[PDB]
């Protein structure tokens, strides 16, 4: 199959405005949310129907308890960072963990933290060490690296358990995750040529312009891949017309193993 990934995010906020949760945790398979938990509901809940339909209530009950523990841990950790930074006011703490199963069968695994939305600590599961961005992170690095067994545990989770979870969820959601919806592609004149694609799944797509059979990366404007709201995506790319000389322009789209060319006459 194509490349797929599993990742879990956590967000803690130290002094949230009224109503807004102190803690949020959301899981994703590829671009799809699968799970959610926050400090207001204090419940882990499905975010995709093929998760709800395949995981029994004991799963949600058990991880609800773990998440209540992780929420308290996240608050303690953020309190410690903000004390060490000598920071007043509201600050954020984030974690991301997960893995990728690549098309060729290889795997990757990652775990990192951020403070105020910037890299703070990054785990290297091959050297079994934490990269620190500053001296507050460095203090935390020292304490985490003194617990060699927890490092080994995280390497095992990233390399073995995460990949097993991903394969299990990929099969649960195979009707959604493993389908293909090819793009509808057109060109219009707006002077610039706009190559537009819509209606496609998965969101990964490569669109570019060629000028007489040569790519022009520096002159091409690349639009974002955007959710259309119905489970499919849209995207575009534009290139500016030289009004002083004609050229053979052509838009090239690659999606899910199929290449297409729209040669503009």
């Amino acid at each position, epitope marked *: 199959m194509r490349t797929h990934s599993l990742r879990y995010f956590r967000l803690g906020v130290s002094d949230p405005i009224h109503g807004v949760p102190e803690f949020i945790s959301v899981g994703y398979v590829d671009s799809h949310p699968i799970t959610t938990y926050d400090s207001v509901t204090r419940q882990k809940e499905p975010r995709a129907p093929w998760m709800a339909e395949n995981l029994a209530p004991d799963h949600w*009950e058990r991880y609800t308890q773990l998440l209540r523990g*992780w929420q308290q841990m996240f608050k303690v950790e953020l309190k410690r960072l903000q004390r060490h930074y000598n920071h007043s006011g509201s600050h954020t703490y984030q974690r991301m963990i997960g893995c990728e199963l690549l098309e060729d069968g290889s795997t990757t695994g990652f775990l990192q933290y951020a403070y105020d939305g910037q890299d703070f600590l990054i785990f290297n599961k091959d050297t079994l060490s934490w990269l620190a961005v500053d001296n507050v992170a460095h203090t935390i690095k020292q304490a985490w690296e003194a617990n060699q067994h927890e490092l080994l545990y995280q390497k*095992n989770w990233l390399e073995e358990e995460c990949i097993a979870w991903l394969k299990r969820f990929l099969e649960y959601g195979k009707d959604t995750l493993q389908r293909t919806e090819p793009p509808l592609v057109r060109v219009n004149r707006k002077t610039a040529l706009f190559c537009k694609a819509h209606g496609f799944y998965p969101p990964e797509i490569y669109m570019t312009w060629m000028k007489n059979g040569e790519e022009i990366v520096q002159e091409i404007d690349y639009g974002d891949i955007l959710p259309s709201g119905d489970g499919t995506y849209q995207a575009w790319a534009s290139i500016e017309l030289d009004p002083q000389s004609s050229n053979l322009y052509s838009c090239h789209v690659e999606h899910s193993g199929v290449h297409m060319v729209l040669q503009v006459p």
Partner: antibody
Amino acid sequence: GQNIDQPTEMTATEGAIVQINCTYQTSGFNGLFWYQQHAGEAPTFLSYNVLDGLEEKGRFSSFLSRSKGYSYLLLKELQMKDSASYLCAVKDSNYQLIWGAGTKLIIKP
Amino acid sequence: NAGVTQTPKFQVLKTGQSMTLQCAQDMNHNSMYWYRQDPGMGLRLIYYSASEGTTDKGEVPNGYNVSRLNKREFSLRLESAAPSQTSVYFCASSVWTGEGSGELFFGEGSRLTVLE
């Protein structure tokens, strides 16, 4: 279901070596623990393994093979005070601890 | 520096009698557990508390209830004792839970015998 197996009882001679085996079949694996429990007392933590290989800690070493689903606790230069039960335990995919029934180690002076 | 302190060490009960076992830990741990140990089988979790302010059932919750009173204390209640609850009960705690490598610290054990 998930199962963990270890022999009920083992007997060895003072000064010798003993290997206590633990085999597990679990849904996911987040590490294997060994505990010592003297008769009438609380279990206390001996070792943790989660990657493959041998780890040493005094006269005790603990080995793990994830692919075989196997660990042993190796006790060298046995002494009478090693007479105790030895409990194996495995954390499954959901961090639930699955406990073996324990191996009673008897040491002949 | 006492670790995990549970009481009582021994107790005899008549079928139908109520009993509370106390457990406290002074290690600033977040997770607490109540286990029973019976001949011929591995420890079985009765109830646990992953953090202050939450509790949930273990493998053998029926006939028991728990109260995580504060960060330090986790009491186990037998409302109507049954002969099958004759056992050795162990309270335990750990720094956090889900931390894969974190080990358990056990109390000294409470031996209950329930008689008709």
